[PDB]
Design a protein around this ligand. Structure first.
Ligand SMILES: [N]
Ligand SMILES: [N]
Ligand SMILES: [Pt+2]
Ligand SMILES: [Pt+2]
Length: 124
């Protein structure tokens, strides 16, 4: 039902603000985006840039993906991101996360027409 483009936006896009202020962002947004439903998703990044700016990475630096495919793209610019990483103590269904704000290049896998991000590969 959900398109891979729509899944990418649900898991990785939080355009709203350009920051992460609250130490509690990740506990709230991992819940909000259905990433704690059946299990605690251990690691997830949110991108705090406009959808147009993230969709434009698909015409920037072509690189290999971690899986060896060559439809990955590295943002020319650093972006506002939040890294959500499960704490050592976290136990479903009380999923717990540390929030880390950063500015880093993103690497996304692009596919389809329109040619848009379908996978978050890494930040660098
Ligand atoms: N959130
Ligand atoms: N931008
Ligand atoms: Pt949020
Ligand atoms: Pt822009």
């Amino acid at each position: 039902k959900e398109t891979a483009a729509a899944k990418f936006e649900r898991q990785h896009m939080d355009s709203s603000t350009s920051a992460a202020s609250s130490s509690n962002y990740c506990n709230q947004m991992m819940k909000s985006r259905n990433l704690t439903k059946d299990r605690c998703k251990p690691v997830n990044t949110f991108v705090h840039e406009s959808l147009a700016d993230v969709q434009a990475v698909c015409s920037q630096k072509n690189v290999a993906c971690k899986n060896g495919q060559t439809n990955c793209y590295q943002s020319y610019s650093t972006m506002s991101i939040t890294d959500c990483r499960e704490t050592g103590s976290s136990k479903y269904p009380n999923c717990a996360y540390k929030t880390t704000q950063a500015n880093k290049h993103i690497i996304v896998a692009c596919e389809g027409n329109p040619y848009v991000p379908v996978h978050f590969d890494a930040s660098v």
